[PDB]
Amino acid sequence: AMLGGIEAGGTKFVCAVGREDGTIIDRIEFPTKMPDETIEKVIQYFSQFSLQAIGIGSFGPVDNDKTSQTYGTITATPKAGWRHYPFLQTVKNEMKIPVGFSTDVNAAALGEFLFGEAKGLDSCLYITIGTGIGAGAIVEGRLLQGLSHPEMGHIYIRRHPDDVYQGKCPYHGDCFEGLASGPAIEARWGKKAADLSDIAQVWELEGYYIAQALAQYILILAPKKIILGGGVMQQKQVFSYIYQYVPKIMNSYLDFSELSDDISDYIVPPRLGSNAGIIGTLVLAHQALQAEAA
Amino acid sequence: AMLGGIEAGGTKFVCAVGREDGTIIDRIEFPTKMPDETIEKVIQYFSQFSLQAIGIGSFGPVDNDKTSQTYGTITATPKAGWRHYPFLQTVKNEMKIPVGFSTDVNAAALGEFLFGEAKGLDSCLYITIGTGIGAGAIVEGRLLQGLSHPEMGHIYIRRHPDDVYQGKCPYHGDCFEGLASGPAIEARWGKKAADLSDIAQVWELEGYYIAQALAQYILILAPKKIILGGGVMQQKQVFSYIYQYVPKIMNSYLDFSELSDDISDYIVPPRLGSNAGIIGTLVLAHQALQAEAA
Numbered sequence: 263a264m265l266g267g268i269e270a271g272g273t274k275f276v277c278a279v280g281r282e283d284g285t286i287i288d289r290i291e292f293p294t295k296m297p298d299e300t301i302e303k304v305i306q307y308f309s310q311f312s313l314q315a316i317g318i319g320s321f322g323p324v325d326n327d328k329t330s331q332t333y334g335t336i337t338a339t340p341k342a343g344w345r346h347y348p349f350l351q352t353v354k355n356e357m358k359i360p361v362g363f364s365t366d367v368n369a370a371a372l373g374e375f376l377f378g379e380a381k382g383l384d385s386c387l388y389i390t391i392g393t394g395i396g397a398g399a400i401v402e403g404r405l406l407q408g409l410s411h412p413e414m415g416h417i418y419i420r421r422h423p424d425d426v427y428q429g430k431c432p433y434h435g436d437c438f439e440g441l442a443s444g445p446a447i448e449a450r451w452g453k454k455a456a457d458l459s460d461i462a463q464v465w466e467l468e469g470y471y472i473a474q475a476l477a478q479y480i481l482i483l484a485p486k487k488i489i490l491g492g493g494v495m496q497q498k499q500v501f502s503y504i505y506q507y508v509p510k511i512m513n514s515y516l517d518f519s520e521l522s523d524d525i526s527d528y529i530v531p532p533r534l535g536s537n538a539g540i541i542g543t544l545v546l547a548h549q550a551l552q553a554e555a556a
Numbered sequence: 557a558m559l560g561g562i563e564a565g566g567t568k569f570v571c572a573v574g575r576e577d578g579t580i581i582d583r584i585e586f587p588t589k590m591p592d593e594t595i596e597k598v599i600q601y602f603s604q605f606s607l608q609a610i611g612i613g614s615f616g617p618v619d620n621d622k623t624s625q626t627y628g629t630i631t632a633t634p635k636a637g638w639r640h641y642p643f644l645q646t647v648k649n650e651m652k653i654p655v656g657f658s659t660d661v662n663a664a665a666l667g668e669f670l671f672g673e674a675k676g677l678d679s680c681l682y683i684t685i686g687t688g689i690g691a692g693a694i695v696e697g698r699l700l701q702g703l704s705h706p707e708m709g710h711i712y713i714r715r716h717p718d719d720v721y722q723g724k725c726p727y728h729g730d731c732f733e734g735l736a737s738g739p740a741i742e743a744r745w746g747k748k749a750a751d752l753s754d755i756a757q758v759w760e761l762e763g764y765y766i767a768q769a770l771a772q773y774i775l776i777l778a779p780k781k782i783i784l785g786g787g788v789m790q791q792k793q794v795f796s797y798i799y800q801y802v803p804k805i806m807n808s809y810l811d812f813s814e815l816s817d818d819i820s821d822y823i824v825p826p827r828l829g830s831n832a833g834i835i836g837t838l839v840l841a842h843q844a845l846q847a848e849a850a
């Protein structure tokens with residue numbers, strides 16, 4: 263009963279083989295290059311296994327409307343060749359088994375929903391903070407997909423009055439991702455994020471920005487758990503600042519222990535560590551396989 | 557097959573009797589006073605009719621978790637007597653028929669979802685802009701209820717650099733409601749909203765603020781239709797400014813015609829005019845009645 267997953271990133275692809283309970287049997291990774299040659303490496307890796315289904319969690323924006331002619335393509339990216347490349351369809355054509363598709367952060371959300379911190383709940387929100395910011399939400403046990411999947415990393419939070427950085431996002435400048443991604447932390451401070459470890463000021467600022475973003479998500483979706491992952495969130499100090507700032511921002515407007523005394527159990531790192539997304543792509547495989555039996 | 561509705565407002569109650577197709581048979585309104593005497597007027601009006609069920613759409617925050625001990629109470633308000641008053645339970649006890657409960661804007665959303673601009677869709681967002689700002693969302697045909705219902709009117713949008721008004725909201729100051737409610741427009745400009753009709757500047761500012769709020773809701777929920785109601789939105793000029801500003805804010809990040817060329821059919825006034833909420837309380841009645849048959 264083996265399943266394949268592809269977590270398509272802008273810098274790397276991670277492919278894996280595993281089971282529906284989330285165990286990883288095997289995995290490989292390789293640099294993201296042009297699509298033809300990148301997917302060819304994908305196919306070459308899976309050809310060794312007898313797989314029943316595959317799931318793709320891709321960086322987006324993507325067309326995640328099953329009824330759309332461009333379903334399963336990346337709809338916007340500056341990365342050469344990926345926009346409008348028939349990603350889902352080329353994998354379906356070559357492997358000839360069901361293939362599920364979603365964003366990478368939707369994949370992480372399913373992982374943490376079935377096997378991680380949101381197991382037993384019916385709602386959660388997974389936010390990744392790395393090269394980009396993105397988030398995926400589960401409402402009533404099902405991924406949130408409206409007109410588009412969400413693009414929660416491009417909301418315009420309020421600047422800090424002492425921050426003079428113009429922002430990294432090429433569309434918005436100083437949206438959340440623009441102010442608070444890993445690359446925004448570097449462009450702002452002049453060194454790599456992992457190396458700013460001991461400059462408290464960087465992490466108060468980062469936490470202030472995440473906190474503002476979370477206030478909005480709480481007011482708008484009100485998820486029953488918020489899981490924060492990605493490279494930047496390896497600085498576990500950021501959590502303590504978020505815990506201090508969310509309540510100050512909300513200012514007691516919504517009386518839930520999740521938002522005050524027990525906030526440290528509401529906004530948490532992922533139980534699956536950095537594997538939420540790849541594990542979640544096994545879930546997307548499994549769903550695709552069940553939809554074909556249906 | 558007659559149903560009752562109560563739209564509980566901070567200034568007035570509107571009660572009505574009607575049918576599940578949304579027709580209003582009769583209605584009454586009266587000032588919101590203390591609860592005992594206000595609910596007593598409610599009971600006195602319904603005693604004339606043979607009703608099968610009732611629905612309450614209340615101003616909130618409210619406890620809208622069916623499994624909660626304080627289910628069907630208003631959990632926060634400065635209005636004398638209403639906090640923690642057993643509103644739902646006192647109506648259930650006196651009428652002895654099923655009673656549905658939700659926010660007032662959730663009620664409006666159901667109205668427009670079954671009978672208005674979102675009929676045939678599976679998702680929508682209803683926003684009221686009046687004494688307060690609030691919103692209710694339908695995802696996959698079902699009201700969005702997480703940890704709390706949403707309180708979308710208290711998000712911290714960005715100020716306009718020329719606006720020096722400190723904000724009306726007693727919790728946040730210059731959150732969205734704080735900047736853009738009817739009373740914020742008056743406290744800011746020194747006259748009543750209906751009388752600022754011809755000062756274009758008031759409505760550019762109002763539209764700029766709504767537009768910022770909508771950008772966030774689109775990025776976070778991505779609803780398939782956005783309906784704007786309430787007293788302030790009787791100045792239909794505000795729509796033209798929103799249509800100009802949403803696309804500038806999003807800056808082509810999400811390529812959907814709803815967000816650009818066809819934006820005038822995406823963000824719209826309610827088809828049910830100012831009766832979305834009361835009509836929606838008939839829907840909540842009908843749902844409560846079906847849950848009892850189940």
Ligand SMILES: Nc1ncnc2c1ncn2[C@@H]1O[C@H](COP(=O)(O)OP(=O)(O)O)[C@@H](O)[C@H]1O
Nearest residue numbers: 271392393394444445455456492493494496497
């Ligand atoms: N241990 C770390 N601590 C802080 N920042 C890190 C760490 N590792 C990577 N980063 C930063 O996070 C970003 C990478 O995000 P990540 O989730 O690791 O991958 P990607 O977003 O490229 O798929 C980079 O800008 C990098 O500087």
Ligand SMILES: Nc1ncnc2c1ncn2[C@@H]1O[C@H](COP(=O)(O)OP(=O)(O)O)[C@@H](O)[C@H]1O
Nearest residue numbers: 565686687688738739749750786787788790791
């Ligand atoms: N025709 C109108 N044009 C502009 N503003 C209005 C109009 N009617 C009422 N208002 C304003 O909208 C607010 C009232 O909101 P509304 O939805 O009518 O009721 P409430 O929020 O009290 O239930 C007030 O601050 C008032 O000044």
Ligand SMILES: OC[C@H]1O[C@](O)(CO)[C@@H](O)[C@@H]1O
Nearest residue numbers: 321322323367394395396415
């Ligand atoms: O991968 C992190 C996030 O960055 C984006 O590509 C755009 O900001 C999102 O689609 C994604 O979920």
Ligand SMILES: OC[C@H]1O[C@](O)(CO)[C@@H](O)[C@@H]1O
Nearest residue numbers: 615616617661688689690709
């Ligand atoms: O009634 C308009 C809106 O104002 C509030 O009472 C708080 O801002 C919300 O609960 C409501 O939906």
Ligand SMILES: [Zn+2]
Nearest residue numbers: 416431434437
């Ligand atoms: Zn952006």
Ligand SMILES: [Zn+2]
Nearest residue numbers: 710725728731
């Ligand atoms: Zn507020």
